[PDB]
Design a protein around this nucleic acid. Structure first.
Ligand SMILES: Nc1ncnc2c1ncn2[C@@H]1O[C@H](COP(=O)(O)OP(=O)(O)O)[C@@H](O)[C@H]1O
Ligand SMILES: [Cl-]
Ligand SMILES: [Mn+2]
Ligand SMILES: [Mn+2]
Ligand SMILES: [Mn+2]
Length: 534
RNA sequence: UAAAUUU
RNA sequence: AAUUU
């Protein structure tokens, strides 16, 4: 039936100028050598992304879908949700949010300026009065950094982002913010991934795995998910929203947003031209995550049922899914996954790479990450979350006139502190740099470098400073990512770490704590690291 | 562009 | 601010 997009042929223009790397990268030329491999997806590539996602969708539902959908609405009705005052919605707008066409931006919205509030007041009136006129959207190319991969095509084309004007974004929030906070967890219970921290995620997977007599695991992702979402899916999304108890004023707003925005509309490029028309998810609306998550969950739970997956325990985050079940033998397990995938394909969520049963927790990747294992200070197995370092390292070497990557280093150091690639590579580089520019006591992204051991202890446990004997997969992948980017191998970082450590300790104070906890892996004279007041 | 998590 | 989808 429905084509995901149609195109006037106008270009998908850039929303500003897209910075180029420079002939010297002074922050990262010590980190890695292959700067030619680090690139930023650009709007020039936007039309290739368009070709890849423009396609025809035929959806065939069935008893299993209908059944799961039914049960999900009974869940929805145990939910009470309120409108949000125009003001409360204004103040949830992020500080840099793209300004409105109508001559005001996010400063004004967040400070409740009167031109902003009056405009928004009328946009909301118009949603209540008019329940069908399509609402124009702006289409744009996302700039993200990656390492080139000649195996999978060289350079990825840019993701397409599609969004309404600021005034509309606020009204979305008035109608739906409260729902986004309550509904997903109500519908999906323990399966809703975003509710968990990373360490809860790991614990959840291990409990799931442990409780099977004979576990089997797999993951699924949908190829161009936003494109695979149909009008009917979006309307089914509405009817799930409507199954809650809601002010009538909300229902009309939901219904109107659904029909005027969510199921489709005209798209304008950044220079004002009509660009095309859209009959799938616009990634950029408030309901993107919740919508994706819920809809993925319906299809997936139905597909599980269509396929005989026994005692499934799910984790869903957007279009990213993990299922851990009772193996029915591998011959059956293969047949059932073939079936799972056929069902998802009938429901219009076809796979990027078709899935595969696995019987070892390390081999299951989802949300670009997986669980691994190492040994802790007393010899006990310590399970933790990790990922291929390729992208984080690439992003670590993105330096331009506008952008510095030091924040990226820190963010990864915190999130992935127990991994061998953060400990040996990023930490060493990060500290090495700040020491030399003598900027340790400074505050990056509202964090102080000198607080890290505390921060990491709070978050990952003290075992993060004493883990050893990392896995073959993980050693191989790290080694291999450093070779791919022209970074020193691990033995060299061992050396640089000793040096950094020594210099940090001689500095004394917090510095020295940093040096003793964060780099104990680097010495043979391993210390007895004790818990930290802070 | 939106959300979640971490901070 | 970081990361993810
Ligand atoms: N930067 C982003 N902004 C908004 N939505 C996003 C973003 N990245 C991913 N998503 C949403 O989640 C969906 C699944 O993401 P992913 O599997 O990572 O890519 P794909 O679109 O190729 O399936 C996307 O289609 C999109 O709707
Ligand atoms: Cl231990
Ligand atoms: Mn996907
Ligand atoms: Mn309706
Ligand atoms: Mn995905």
């Amino acid at each position: 039936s429905s084509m995901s997009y149609s195109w006037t042929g106008a270009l998908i223009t850039p929303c500003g100028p897209e910075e180029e790397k420079l002939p010297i990268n002074p922050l990262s030329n010590s980190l890695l050598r292959y700067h030619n491999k680090v690139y930023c997806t650009t709007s020039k590539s936007a039309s290739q992304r368009a070709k890849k996602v423009t396609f025809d969708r035929t959806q065939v539902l069935d008893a299993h879908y209908d059944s799961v959908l039914k049960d999900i609405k009974l869940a929805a009705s145990k939910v009470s949700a309120r409108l949000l005052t125009l003001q409360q919605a204004c103040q949830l707008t992020p500080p840099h949010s793209a300004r409105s066409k109508y001559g005001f931006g996010a400063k004004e919205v967040r400070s409740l300026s009167g031109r902003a509030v009056n405009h928004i007041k009328s946009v909301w009136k118009d949603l209540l009065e008019d329940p069908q006129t399509p609402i124009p959207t702006t289409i744009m190319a996302k700039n993200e950094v990656f390492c080139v991969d000649p195996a999978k095509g060289g350079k990825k084309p840019a993701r397409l982002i599609v969004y309404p004007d600021l005034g509309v974004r606020v009204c979305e929030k008035m109608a739906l913010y409260d729902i986004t906070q309550k509904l997903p967890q109500a519908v999906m219970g323990a399966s809703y991934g975003f509710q968990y921290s990373p360490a809860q995620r790991v614990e959840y997977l291990l409990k799931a795995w442990a409780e099977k007599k004979d576990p089997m695991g797999f993951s699924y992702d949908t190829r161009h998910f936003d494109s695979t979402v149909t009008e009917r899916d979006i309307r089914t999304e509405e009817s799930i929203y409507q199954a809650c108890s809601l002010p009538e004023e909300a229902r009309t707003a939901i219904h109107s947003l659904t029909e005027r925005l969510y199921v489709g509309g005209p798209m304008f490029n950044s220079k004002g031209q009509t660009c095309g028309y859209r009959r799938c998810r616009a990634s950029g609306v408030l309901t993107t995550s919740m919508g994706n998550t819920i809809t993925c969950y319906v299809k997936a739970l139905a597909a599980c049922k269509a396929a005989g997956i026994v005692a499934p325990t799910m984790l869903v985050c957007g279009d990213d899914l993990i299922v851990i079940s009772e193996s029915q033998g591998t011959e059956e397990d293969e047949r059932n996954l073939r079936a799972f995938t056929e069902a998802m394909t009938r429901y219009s969520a076809p796979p990027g790479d078709p899935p595969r049963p696995e019987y070892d927790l390390e081999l299951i990747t989802s949300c670009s990450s997986n669980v691994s294992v190492a040994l802790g200070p007393r010899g006990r197995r310590r399970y933790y979350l990790t990922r291929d370092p390729t992208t984080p390292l690439a992003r670590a070497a993105w330096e331009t006139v506008r952008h510095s990557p030091i924040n990226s280093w820190l963010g990864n150091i915190i999130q992935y502190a127990p991994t061998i690639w953060v400990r040996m590579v990023l930490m060493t580089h990060f500290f090495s740099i700040l020491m030399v520019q003598d900027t340790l006591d400074q505050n990056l992204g509202g964090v102080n470098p000198l607080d890290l051991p505390a921060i990491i202890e709070r978050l990952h446990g003290l075992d993060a400073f004493s883990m050893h004997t990392y896995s073959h997969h993980e050693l191989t992948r790290v080694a291999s990512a450093l070779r791919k980017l022209g970074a020193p191998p691990l033995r060299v970082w061992k050396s640089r770490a000793r040096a950094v450590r020594a210099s940090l300790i001689s500095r004394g104070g917090k510095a020295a704590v940093c040096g003793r906890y964060l780099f104990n892996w680097a010495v043979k004279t391993k210390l007895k690291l004790t818990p930290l007041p802070e």
